[PDB]
Design a protein around this motif. Structure first.
Motif, PDB file in Angstrom:
ATOM      1  N   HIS A   1     -45.752  -1.074 -35.453  1.00 22.82           N
ATOM      2  CA  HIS A   1     -46.334   0.201 -35.542  1.00 22.82           C
ATOM      3  C   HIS A   1     -45.515   1.508 -36.083  1.00 22.82           C
ATOM      4  O   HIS A   1     -44.165   1.265 -36.613  1.00 22.82           O
TER       5      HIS A   1
ATOM      6  N   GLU B   1     -44.644   5.804 -36.790  1.00 26.96           N
ATOM      7  CA  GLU B   1     -45.052   6.566 -36.271  1.00 26.96           C
ATOM      8  C   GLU B   1     -45.124   7.746 -37.431  1.00 26.96           C
ATOM      9  O   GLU B   1     -43.916   7.186 -38.414  1.00 26.96           O
TER      10      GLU B   1
ATOM     11  N   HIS C   1     -41.947  -0.316 -35.916  1.00 30.43           N
ATOM     12  CA  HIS C   1     -41.264  -1.325 -34.689  1.00 30.43           C
ATOM     13  C   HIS C   1     -42.314  -1.963 -34.396  1.00 30.43           C
ATOM     14  O   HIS C   1     -43.182  -1.119 -33.709  1.00 30.43           O
TER      15      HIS C   1
ATOM     16  N   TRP D   1     -40.398  12.667 -29.834  1.00 30.55           N
ATOM     17  CA  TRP D   1     -40.891  12.141 -31.065  1.00 30.55           C
ATOM     18  C   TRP D   1     -40.500  14.192 -31.551  1.00 30.55           C
ATOM     19  O   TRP D   1     -40.825  15.178 -30.477  1.00 30.55           O
TER      20      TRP D   1
HETATM   21 ZN   LIG Z   1     -43.880   4.007 -31.341  1.00 25.35          ZN
END
Ligand SMILES: [Zn+2]
Ligand SMILES: O=C(O)CCC(=O)C(=O)O
Ligand SMILES: O=C(O)CCC(=O)C(=O)O
Ligand SMILES: [Zn+2]
Lengths: 341, 341
Positions: free
Chosen positions: B191, B193, B271, B288
């Motif tokens: 996925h 981000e 990733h 993040w």
């Molecule tokens: Zn992630």
């Protein structure tokens, strides 16, 4: 029930059928007739309100133009420049010249040539002269420069009726009246407009095949940045069912207009327009109006034309965002493959 | 050159290889190694600047957490609620619960269960107890409620280094630190981000396979309104090449992180993350950050992530405009078929 234009109408004074079946080209798809109604008929008011097509037989919208013909016009239309489209085939596909920048691999099959009215009449009679194969179509916005008597003619059109129409429908402003003079057999292939159109027939007979906006999937318009934006990619004479499979599901509304008829072509309705074969020259004046403002705010479920407007805007923004109209397709493909198909 | 994670690294004090090839799952695609560099190495500064991944071996980013383990944490992490994900398989696909409204035909394979830390440790030892097949993964934003000594640990992370990083890159604000505690063999499948991520490994070993944003076409994310938005639809263990043909062209950047390593996962990089088999439990804290503001204004040619951001926004607006996320696909299809493909 797939009648089409119906049995041909009989001219007043026993003058025999106006036209006949063999003047109509033949296509792969079926059609139902557009209704011919009187302007006083509530049902015709229904159809326009609901944005469905209707042929109004008694508007007098362009009464004073019914006497028009080439001699009268050459005489009275002035010395302005007239746009005249040329072609080797009967199909006059149109090119937006502003858009030709961003598509090189696009050569015309219909060149615009500016010329005085007499040069048009002349060219026409030079071609007639010697049975030449080529064809022309004059299409020119009426405007300022036009002679005294054409203006009186113009002023005599039925503004009271059409302005009431503009008002009842909440339409915006009249944008243009286009004057169209065609040779027999000329086809303007299937396309749609964003304006509302009262299409007022003056000389000769045209067959008009319309398709509602919800047939978008069957008619395969060009990309919005392509110069033939809003035109069908399908050749009606030789449809490619491998590329355009939904064309096999296309269903038309069809009619033949003659002198005095007005055809309401609603916004986003596809139309295909052919001057009858061996019918002689045709003359038409149209009346384009903006279209009522968009509703505050949306009410669901959306109308077909609203979904079309959305597809157009997606294509446009993506053109802008990507810096290049040519990258619109690869992006959309990447967006759908394995994701939404 | 398709080395992968390279020969396994040798622990200090002759303690033998940290892990071995047979701890790694096997896939259909090739990989090149992500570089392991020192934080003082200009080349690592290059990679982060250019938004390419890099494994920094000496940041001390989470030095005080290296002593962490279940006993220490159970002891010190407080009585707050912890999100714990369950699964019957090794693959922990995640569901956005806000999005499950607009997709009914979507049942979970990984339920979130809120529980106190001791209930986690307990469940873990109840499962271990009897060789049960099921698996858990705790994933919980660090926050207020956390015990005195975890806070001291947290405060001891290397803020000086990571804040300089935030500053040099023009990133926005730190949004969250997620604490991840996994069982051996757990996979978080591929996925991406929208945030920038410093992924700081604390206990155990994880293999991280990354794919750059320009592999969008090979990895087939779910629709944006689907609950698995941003996740690949491809099952890495059993890839469906009929549906996902471009998966056959996928090329990864791969590495194995252990205690002390920090992996920079750049924004929009795909990733896939697996805790080594028979490696025991893994522990990770991520960091993040928002992502530098968008440039005023665009400079062409666009970066891959920028094209991704565009595709996302098209899907979103079309969701809104149509009144219903379910109508996004039929519209896009109608827009491309016979038009852009
Ligand atoms: Zn992630
Ligand atoms: O008469 C024609 O061939 C073209 C008419 C038309 O396309 C229009 O009025 O919108
Ligand atoms: O460690 C994992 O399995 C998930 C890590 C991850 O996806 C992230 O930090 O963005
Ligand atoms: Zn038209």
């Amino acid at each position: 029930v797939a009648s089409g234009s119906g049995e041909p109408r009989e001219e007043a004074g026993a003058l025999g059928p106006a036209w006949d079946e063999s003047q109509l080209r033949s296509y792969s798809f079926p059609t139902r007739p557009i209704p011919r109604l009187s302007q006083s008929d509530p049902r015709a008011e229904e159809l326009i309100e609901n944005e469905e097509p209707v042929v109004l037989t008694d508007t007098n919208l362009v009464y004073p133009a019914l006497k028009w013909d080439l001699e009268y016009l050459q005489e009275n239309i002035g010395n302005g420049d007239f746009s005249v489209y040329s072609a080797s085939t009967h199909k006059f596909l149109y090119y937006d010249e502003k858009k030709m920048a961003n598509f090189q691999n696009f050569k015309p099959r219909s060149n615009r040539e500016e010329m005085k009215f007499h040069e048009f009449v002349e060219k026409l009679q030079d071609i007639q002269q010697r049975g030449g194969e080529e064809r022309l179509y004059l299409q020119q916005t009426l405007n300022d420069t036009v002679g005294r008597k054409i203006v009186m003619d113009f002023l005599g059109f039925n503004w009271n009726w059409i302005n009431k129409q503009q008002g009842k429908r909440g339409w915006g402003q009249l944008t243009s009246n286009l004057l169209l003079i065609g040779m027999e057999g000329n086809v303007t292939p299937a396309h749609y407009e964003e304006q509302q159109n009262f299409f007022a027939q003056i000389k000769g007979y045209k067959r008009c095949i319309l398709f509602p906006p919800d047939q978008f999937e069957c008619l395969y318009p060009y990309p919005v940045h392509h110069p033939c934006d809003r035109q069908s990619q399908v050749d009606f004479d030789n449809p490619d069912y491998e590329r355009f499979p939904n064309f096999q599901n296309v269903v038309g509304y069809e009619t033949v207009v003659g002198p005095g008829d007005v055809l309401y072509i609603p916004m986003y309705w596809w139309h295909h327009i052919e001057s009858l074969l061996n019918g002689g020259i045709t003359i038409t004046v149209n009346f384009w109006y903006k279209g009522a403002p968009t509703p505050k705010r949306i009410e669901y479920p959306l109308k077909a034309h609203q979904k079309v407007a959305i597809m157009r805007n997606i294509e446009k923004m993506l053109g802008e965002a990507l810096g290049n109209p040519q990258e619109v397709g690869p992006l959309l493909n990447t967006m759908i493959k394995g994701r939404y198909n």
